[PDB]
């Protein structure tokens, strides 16, 4: 099918703004119990964990290379 007529500005605004509610803002922000950095709720920190996971990955690769 094809549009009968061109859309007015008002209809476009009312359609693209109100019903979609834009982006609903909740609070995901929580302070890390360890380093005190701001991170997401119900989730592990992105500071004191990713570095320890990379150090654990390097230690696992070094142990796997030393065992072989």
């Amino acid at each position: 099918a094809a549009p009968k007529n061109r859309r007015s500005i008002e209809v476009n605004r009312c359609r693209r703004r109100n019903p979609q509610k834009l982006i609903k803002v909740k609070n995901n922000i929580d302070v890390c119990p360890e380093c005190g950095h701001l991170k997401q709720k119900h989730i592990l920190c992105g500071y004191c964990x990713x570095x320890x996971x990379x150090x654990x990955x390097x230690x696992x690769x070094x142990x796997x290379x030393x065992x072989x």
Binding site: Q40, H42, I43, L44, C45, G46, X49, X50
Partner: protein, 120 residues
């Protein structure tokens, strides 16, 4: 309909699903911890517990043996599973395969990331 149904799909066929589970479990038992999507992880939990229990059954027993040979093709995983990983969980019942959530998301699909790890 989805009424009363476990055993999800995740856009993969039955063979692809089983093989995916076998691969994720391979990586899990190999590295002792892995990172994957929340759905695949949550699905992998039960099967992991099942393989662990199968390891808890017996070493000499044929049922457990051929089951372990069926799911895991790799010859490196089985002895490390039975001799090492199994005896430490001997006292535990539901105490294995812990799931945690990863803070960030992928730059492409923004897929929710989660990690599965056995108790050390």
């Amino acid at each position: 309909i989805s009424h009363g149904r476990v055993f999800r799909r995740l856009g993969l066929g039955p063979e692809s699903r089983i093989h995916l589970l076998q691969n994720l479990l391979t990586g899990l038992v190999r590295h002792e911890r892995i990172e994957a999507s929340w759905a695949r992880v949550d699905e992998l939990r039960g099967y992991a517990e099942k393989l662990i229990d199968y390891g808890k059954l017996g070493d000499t027993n044929e049922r457990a043996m051929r089951m372990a040979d069926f799911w895991l093709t790799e010859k490196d995983l089985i002895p490390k599973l039975f001799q090492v990983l199994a005896p430490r969980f001997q006292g535990q019942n539901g105490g294995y395969t812990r799931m945690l959530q990863i803070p960030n998301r992928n730059e492409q699909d923004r897929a929710k990331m989660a990690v599965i790890e056995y108790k050390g």
